[PDB]
Design a protein around this nucleic acid. Structure first.
Ligand SMILES: [Mg+2]
Length: 604
DNA sequence: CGACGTT
């Protein structure tokens, strides 16, 4: 791990020399460092170029501390770099490219040279290794503890924004970052080349996602804060009523939110035997315990209602109005592309993928999302996608025929399990088969179904036996995947995304069963994520080539909520439809139930 | 309720 060959650029002539080197440089790093953690309101501070291993350059453009000398104009430097950054033939490399690209696009410079991202490379190679962050990557691959931002800043309010930070420390840190990316690239890229499936997915599914991810995050979803600042008042009043009722039942004032106090007061005053126990050993008070106890006493019911209301209020109705970006008035999310192992995108700060649906008050919370003016929400959706991947990967004629004909999968499964035809499949049989399908997706055991269906576990096993006998190809494929995990350990999805299992041969019964379940459902969710990502890429290509009156705002799991102008709804819905069924060459069709509701809940 | 685990 070399160092000290780090030249910091203060004059534009050295910048010209560096760009002359860069335009002949095949691959090079790019790591813009910025004061603000935000990707939208942040103002750029400096850049970083590392054409050759150890040969890294930091280019300050605005430093705020006393006597920051010869600061190149942030506009002049970017104007001189526009031929380079906006070049397609120059392949770049970095970390979290949807951050650098967003920061650059703040100034109108649309970057186009992205080809490698160390985060994405580390994700594709071994998705269950570390956390895919520079600090972890450093020792995990290069075996070189790098300088963190904490040393320069210091935890707490004492932490310093990067812009006023002294020249030497900031420059050496950024150049070390750039240089590191190069070492990580030069080390991992041969490994990424040796793996054909991972190479395919990395080139075609993961990396073209970065520009559309940045565009989606910068577009942001619009919320009507008045709805939440109204609705929280009714939430507070209702929970106050629940407080009054609970303190009437118990005769004392306390906090329903606390769990230790709640279990103590409950199990000492009313004294029901603890049905279940927490993983920590204490008596458990989860929702099942709540409903079982509310079968007997009203205080469990009222505290369950308090939990239900308070969770949604505190998590959404209070946090979302706070997170509205004041500059543009739209909530901006950070889709972390590589954090979950399976492959799904997971929105963070705030979790837009975690908006309530099943509760009517959750329906109100989803109604809080609206359109600015003359616009209307289009909520794309894949219906029962996981079962479609199951049919494709099982090669079972029954499910393939059922999906090709287009009948509801749940009633068809119930018909094939119980014998009576699908038209006579009633509601209880229907959601019984629904539980069968979902559980088989997740790999759960018969006790789980006795819990999720309130039927004896013997009857659960009998029902799965009927299903398994009528669908032997699915079981054969699942056993093939289980066995494949033994000698390969990287049970793999369709498009080549892998998952290394360090728990397949753990020789422990507890871990291996969960490892087997993960091996079962890994191709499932992996294929679903790849299909969604490819649909995202195609739709983004359509918008960026045609520029219609549509803006993609969010990507929930198997959902692609848009925002269209009122007069476009007739044709753009059909166009995105066609773009999405033609997304992936899979035999079973990919049904897309496009809504066109005025608000997100209405479109849902 | 049945398979996994240990004294
Ligand atoms: Mg970076």
């Amino acid at each position: 791990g070399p160092h000290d060959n780090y030249v910091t650029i203060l004059d534009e002539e050295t910048l010209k020399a560096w760009i002359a080197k860069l335009e002949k440089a095949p691959v090079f790093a790019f790591d813009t460092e910025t004061d603000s953690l935000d990707n939208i309101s942040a103002n750029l501070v400096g850049l970083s170029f590392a054409i050759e291993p150890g040969v890294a350059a930091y280019i300050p453009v605005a430093h705020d501390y006393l006597d920051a000398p010869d600061q190149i104009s942030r506009e002049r430097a970017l104007e001189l770099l526009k031929p380079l950054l906006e070049d397609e033939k120059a392949l770049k490399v970095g970390q979290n490219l949807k951050y650098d690209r967003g920061i650059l696009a703040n100034y109108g410079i649309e970057l186009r040279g992205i080809a490698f991202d160390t985060m994405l490379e580390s994700y594709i190679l071994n998705s269950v290794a570390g956390r895919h962050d520079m600090d972890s990557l450093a020792e995990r691959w290069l075996k070189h503890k790098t300088i963190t931002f904490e040393e320069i800043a210091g935890k707490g309010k004492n932490q310093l924004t990067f812009n006023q930070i002294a020249l030497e420390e900031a420059g050496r840190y950024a150049a070390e970052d750039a240089d590191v990316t190069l070492q990580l690239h030069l080390k991992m890229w041969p490994d990424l080349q040796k793996h054909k499936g991972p190479l395919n997915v990395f080139e075609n599914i993961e990396m073209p996602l970065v520009p559309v991810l940045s565009r989606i995050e910068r577009n942001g979803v619009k919320i009507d804060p008045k709805v939440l600042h109204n609705h929280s008042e009714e939430l507070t009043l209702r929970l106050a009523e629940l407080e009054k009722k609970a303190h009437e039942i118990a005769g004392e004032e306390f906090n329903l939110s606390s769990t230790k106090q709640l279990q103590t007061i409950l199990f000492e005053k009313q004294g029901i035997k603890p049905l279940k126990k927490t993983p920590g050993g204490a008596p458990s008070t989860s929702e099942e315990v709540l409903e079982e106890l509310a079968l007997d006493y009203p205080l469990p019911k009222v505290i369950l209602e308090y939990r239900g209301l308070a969770k949604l209020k505190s998590t959404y109705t209070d946090k979302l109005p706070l997170m509205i970006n004041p500059k543009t008035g739209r909530v901006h999310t950070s889709y972390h592309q590589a954090v979950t192992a399976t492959g799904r995108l997971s929105s963070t700060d705030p979790n837009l993928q975690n908006i309530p649906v099943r509760n009517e008050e959750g329906r109100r919370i989803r109604q809080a999302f609206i359109a600015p003016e003359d616009y209307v929400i289009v909520s794309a959706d894949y219906s029962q996608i996981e079962l479609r991947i199951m049919a494709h990967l099982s090669r079972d004629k029954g499910l393939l025929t059922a999906f090709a004909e287009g009948k509801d999968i749940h009633r068809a499964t119930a018909a094939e399990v119980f014998g009576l035809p699908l038209e006579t499949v009633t509601s209880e049989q229907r959601r019984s088969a629904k539980a069968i399908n979902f559980g088989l997706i997740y790999g759960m055991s018969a006790f789980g179904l006795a819990r999720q269906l309130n039927i004896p576990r013997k009857e659960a096993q009998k029902y799965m036996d009927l299903y398994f006998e009528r669908y032997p190809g699915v079981l054969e494929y699942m056993e093939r995947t289980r066995a494949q995990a033994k000698e390969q350990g990287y049970v793999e999805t369709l498009d080549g995304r892998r998952l290394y299992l360090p728990d397949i041969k753990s020789s422990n019964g507890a871990r291996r069963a969960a490892a087997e379940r993960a091996a079962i459902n890994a191709p499932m969710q992996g294929t679903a994520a790849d299909i969604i990502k490819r649909a995202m890429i195609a739709v983004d290509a359509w918008l960026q080539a045609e520029q219609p009156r549509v803006r993609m705002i969010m990507q929930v799991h198997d959902e692609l909520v848009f925002e269209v102008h009122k007069d476009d709804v007739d044709a753009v819905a059909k166009q995105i439809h066609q773009l999405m069924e033609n997304c992936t060459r899979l035999d079973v069709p990919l049904l897309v139930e496009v809504g066109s509701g005025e608000n997100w809940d209405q479109a849902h």
